[PDB]
Amino acid sequence: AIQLTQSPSSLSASVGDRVTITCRASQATSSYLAWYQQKPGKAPKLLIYAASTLQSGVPSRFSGSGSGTDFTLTITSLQPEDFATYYCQLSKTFGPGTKVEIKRTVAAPSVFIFPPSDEQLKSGTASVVCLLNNFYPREAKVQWKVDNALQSGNSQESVTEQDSKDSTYSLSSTLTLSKADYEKHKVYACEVTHQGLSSPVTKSFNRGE
């Protein structure tokens, strides 16, 4: 019966930049709420409780204050390890949470290509994977040319989580094809365009070479 909103839903700040995160509650108490920091793949960790008291252990740069229907979380400076999704709770219901990233310079991606393994060929299928690593921003156009022909609708791409050391992402695209299709073509190239690249980069290989 209580609705909590998180303002903003998502944001991105540079290193050492003060960021304020505000979550609003219809029924204010300033005594039963707390803020949780959650990193992906890990349990949420408590940050501050009672909206003003800082938990021990966590660095003092996480300060929260405010009263009335509004409550804010203040971070004095951001670090690459501080990327998380911050959740504010009101003793019964957790807010939608805010995705917080970390901004830095534009990073040039590294591209790698792996033909399917011999054991996979024995299985009768083929799975070609292109590794696209350590870049910034996340957006990156991935293209595949097989015998100077584009392919689409048969490949899947997965995006990892941003590294907490150097603040870069990584991508991989996988195409599942039968052995007949693999043996029907000789050249296979991985072409990717990124704003960190002045010119497009492609890596072409020949099967059996």
């Binding site: 204010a28 108490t29 300033s30 005594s31 003793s91 019964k92």
Partner: protein, 218 residues
């Protein structure tokens, strides 16, 4: 400014429910919980239960689990106490208390408190009786004069002497209970030389029965 206002005194029959209202002011009600502590003479300051004023989960003391329940009307910022099947010994003073700074403190501010007495008897006007030194009690310069009260209910009674003119040496006593009716007396110290123009007259005023009596002493 923090202040708790509470209801007045009640007198009820045994086995009937009574209501106690505690209204708070000067602070946002939803922030701080409310306690309830009972004060009596057989027991001293036993704890009744707490009301977490935000959500509503109650933590009653195990002894008062059945005979007491607590309710909150957040609209008027008031805390309520409900009691059932009141016994004769239940006559006590019930305090409502704000809990402050969860983590520190325990109990910040206490209301003026309401005293609920049960008894069985109906309201009865007091009977004022005189006490005077005897015909062989004039052997000292100072003697003790006083009047006493029987068969009244309920408390209290204010006694004056010459309509309060003689406020020195007047001594009253706390009420006592026997045969379901309360009892108290009073006494003063006066010189044993009563002048013809000097008289002592003690007046008993009782607002429960709206009856005032003056008793002829000397």
């Amino acid at each position: 400014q923090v202040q708790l206002q509470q209801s007045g005194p009640e007198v009820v029959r045994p086995g009937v429910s009574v209501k106690i209202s505690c209204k708070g002011s000067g602070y946002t009600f939803t922030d701080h919980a409310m306690h309830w502590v009972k004060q009596s003479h057989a027991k001293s300051l036993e704890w009744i239960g707490v009301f977490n004023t935000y959500n509503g989960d109650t933590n009653y003391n195990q002894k008062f689990e059945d005979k007491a329940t607590m309710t909150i009307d957040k609209s008027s910022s008031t805390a309520y106490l409900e009691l059932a099947r009141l016994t004769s010994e239940d006559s006590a003073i019930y305090y409502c208390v704000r809990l402050g700074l969860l983590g520190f403190y325990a109990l910040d501010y206490w209301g003026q408190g309401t005293s609920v007495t049960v008894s069985s008897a109906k309201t009865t006007p007091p009977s004022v009786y005189p006490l005077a030194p005897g015909s062989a009690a004039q052997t000292n310069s100072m003697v003790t004069l006083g009047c006493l009260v029987k068969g009244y209910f309920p408390e209290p009674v204010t006694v004056t002497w010459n309509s309060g003119s003689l406020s020195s040496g007047v001594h009253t006593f706390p009420a006592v209970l026997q045969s379901d009716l309360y009892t108290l007396s009073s006494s003063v110290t006066v010189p044993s030389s009563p002048r013809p123009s000097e008289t002592v007259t003690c007046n008993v005023a009782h607002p429960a029965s709206s009856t005032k009596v003056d008793k002829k002493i000397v």
